[PDB]
Write a protein that binds this ligand. Sequence first.
Ligand SMILES: C[N+](C)(C)CCO
Ligand SMILES: C[N+](C)(C)CCO
Ligand SMILES: C[N+](C)(C)CCO
Ligand SMILES: C[N+](C)(C)CCO
Ligand SMILES: C[N+](C)(C)CCO
Ligand SMILES: C[N+](C)(C)CCO
Ligand SMILES: C[N+](C)(C)CCO
Ligand SMILES: C[N+](C)(C)CCO
Ligand SMILES: C[N+](C)(C)CCO
Ligand SMILES: C[N+](C)(C)CCO
Ligand SMILES: C[N+](C)(C)CCO
Ligand SMILES: C[N+](C)(C)CCO
Ligand SMILES: C[N+](C)(C)CCO
Ligand SMILES: C[N+](C)(C)CCO
Lengths: 292, 293
Amino acid sequence: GWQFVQENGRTYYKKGDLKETYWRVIDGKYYYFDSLSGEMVVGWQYIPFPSKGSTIGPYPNGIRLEGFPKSEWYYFDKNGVLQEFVGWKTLEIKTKDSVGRKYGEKRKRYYTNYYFNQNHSLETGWLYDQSNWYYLAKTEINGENYLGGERRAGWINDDSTWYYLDPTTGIMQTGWQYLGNKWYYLRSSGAMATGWYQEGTTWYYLDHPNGDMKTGWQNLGNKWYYLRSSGAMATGWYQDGSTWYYLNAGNGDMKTGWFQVNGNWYYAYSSGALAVNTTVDGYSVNYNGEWV
Amino acid sequence: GWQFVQENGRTYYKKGDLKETYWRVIDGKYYYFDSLSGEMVVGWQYIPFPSKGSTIGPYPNGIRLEGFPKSEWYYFDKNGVLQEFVGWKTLEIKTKDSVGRKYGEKRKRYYTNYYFNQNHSLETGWLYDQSNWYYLAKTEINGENYLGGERRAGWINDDSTWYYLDPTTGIMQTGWQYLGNKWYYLRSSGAMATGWYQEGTTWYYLDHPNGDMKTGWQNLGNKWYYLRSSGAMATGWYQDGSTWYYLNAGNGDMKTGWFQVNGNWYYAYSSGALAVNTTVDGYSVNYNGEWVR
Ligand SMILES: C[N+](C)(C)CCO
Ligand SMILES: C[N+](C)(C)CCO
Ligand SMILES: C[N+](C)(C)CCO
Ligand SMILES: C[N+](C)(C)CCO
Ligand SMILES: C[N+](C)(C)CCO
Ligand SMILES: C[N+](C)(C)CCO
Ligand SMILES: C[N+](C)(C)CCO
Ligand SMILES: C[N+](C)(C)CCO
Ligand SMILES: C[N+](C)(C)CCO
Ligand SMILES: C[N+](C)(C)CCO
Ligand SMILES: C[N+](C)(C)CCO
Ligand SMILES: C[N+](C)(C)CCO
Ligand SMILES: C[N+](C)(C)CCO
Ligand SMILES: C[N+](C)(C)CCO
C-alpha cells in the first residue's frame, strides 16, 4: 500500500521502495514530490503544472509524450497541501529561504500581494480585475531573485513603455499625474506619453524620453516654443520682461524676421525679440514695432 | 565694398544691401553670420561646418551646392572671431544662455572640460589622449539640453556596455574596482563584465546586468554555486557548519542525488546536504557519506 513515509527528516510517498515524484492527489488534496528525490515540497514552489502522463498520473505503459509542462508558481502549506487559492492573497515574500523548500528542511518575515488564477497558480504581467489594470511581476529566477506575481507599485517599464501603478492600491493610473514635483500624462491605455500632446485646443510638450511636462522656452525641432507655467503652449504676442515675442497663431513656433499680424508688419531679431522704436533694413518701426 | 555694419547693437557684414550669411574669412579670420538674418554669432554655436560652395565661399555664379553640411560645435570669441582651439580647453558650460547667441544680444560662470579636434570643433564620444581613454558627451540638443563634448565622469553607458571614468580626471578605469560598496570587474577594454569571469583558475560571478560581484549561494543557469566571501567560486567539498556539500570539481555546480568522488559514492538530499550514517533509497551510507556496498 501507498503511504507517507518519514525518512531522514523528509517526507516521501512510497509503496515498497517505489517513490512518487511530481504531483499526486492524496485523500482529495494535491501534493508534490521532487522530480529527482521524491522529497515532499512545502511553501512557494516554481514547478511544472500537472499534466497527465508526465507530471501527474496515470502513467499508462507504452507510448511516450514529447515535450514537458511549463512551470508556474504554486503555494503549498507547511504540511505539503497545495493551497487552492483563487483571489488576491497576502502571503510571505519569495526569497531563497521561502522558495523550493522540502518538508523537514531547516528554515523578520515580510508580505505582499499576489493574485491566483482559477488553476491556483500566480498570475504574472498585466491583470484586469474589478474594472482596473494591475501589474504583477514577471518571473525572474536568477541569483538571489525569485520574482513573479508580486503586485507592483510605482513606475514600470513594459516593452519600453512606461506605466505608473498607484503604490497603495496597485491600480494602473491614467490621466495627468503629479509625481516628484512634475507632471506626466498617461494615455487612456496607461501608457506614458512623450512629445506633443493636445487636450481640447491646448498643446502640451512632454519630455522625450522622460515624459515630464515642460514649461518655459523649449527648442523643439529647431523652433522655439513658449510653454506657460501651467504647461500650456502660448500663441500670439507674448511679453517676456519688456521684450515682446510672437508665437505663430496656430502652431506656436516663435517667428523671426519680417512677419505680419492683423495687416501690420513687424520685425523680430534672431533672438525672436520684436524690434521697436528704431530702423531695420531702412524701414522705421514704432513703439509697437509697427512698420511706419 | 564689403564691410562690417552695426545696427540695433548687431553686427552684419554687408556690401550695400547684400548681407553675408554662414561662414566668411575676413582678413584671414573666420566669422559666421546667421543663415536668415546675417547677425554675426558669438560664443558656443552648433552650426554647419565650412563646406566650400555650400556654407563658405566661393560660390561660382552665386550657386549653392545641394544638401547641407553636418553641424559641429564651435567657439567664437565675443567679437565674432572663431577661436581656432585644438586639444583640451576649459570653457563655460553650454546652456540656453550661452549657446547660439548673436553679437549684441544681452545674456558666477560654470566651466568644464572640452576637447577640440584639428578643425577646431568639439570631439564627442571616445577619445584616446595622453595614453588614456576619455568619454566626451554625445551631441544632444533638444528642449533645454545643449549637450556635446563635455568630458564625462563616473558610470557611462555606451552602446549597451557600461564603462567607468574617474570622477576627478575623467580617465577610463580598468580592472577590479570597488565602487559604492561593491566590486566590479572592468575588462582591459574598460567594458564592465557581467556573468562568469575567470581570472587565472578562479571563477567569479558578476551580476547581469548591473555588474556587481556576487558572493554566497547563487542559483545560476538552473544550478547552485557557492561563491566565497572574496567572490571566488568554491569547488570540491564545502562545509557549512555541520553540513557538507559537493561542488563539481571543475564546473563548481552543487550535486544532488547520487554522485561519485575518488571512487566512492555519495548521496546529497535536494538541498545539497550530504547524507551520512543512514539509509538512502535502501542503500547504507557511512559517517563520511560513502556508500557501504
Ligand atoms: C492596458 N494596457 C496597455 C496596460 C495593457 C496592454 O496590453
Ligand atoms: C517616469 N519616468 C521614469 C519616465 C520618468 C520619471 O521620472
Ligand atoms: C497640465 N497641468 C495638469 C499642469 C495643468 C492643467 O491640466
Ligand atoms: C508643433 N505643434 C505640434 C506644437 C503644433 C502643431 O500643430
Ligand atoms: C515688410 N517689409 C517692409 C520688408 C516689406 C513689406 O512688404
Ligand atoms: C529663448 N529665446 C531667446 C529664443 C527667447 C527668450 O529668451
Ligand atoms: C507689441 N504689440 C503692439 C504687438 C503689443 C502691444 O501691446
Ligand atoms: C574604451 N574603448 C574605445 C577602448 C572601448 C570602446 O569604444
Ligand atoms: C551603473 N552600473 C550599472 C554598473 C551600476 C550603477 O549603479
Ligand atoms: C579583486 N578580487 C576580485 C581579487 C577580490 C574582490 O573582492
Ligand atoms: C559554471 N562555471 C562557469 C564556473 C564553470 C565553467 O567551466
Ligand atoms: C549508486 N547507487 C547504486 C548507490 C545508486 C543507484 O541507484
Ligand atoms: C545549497 N543551498 C543554497 C540550497 C543551501 C543554502 O543554505
Ligand atoms: C570527507 N568528506 C569531505 C567526504 C565528508 C566527511 O564527512
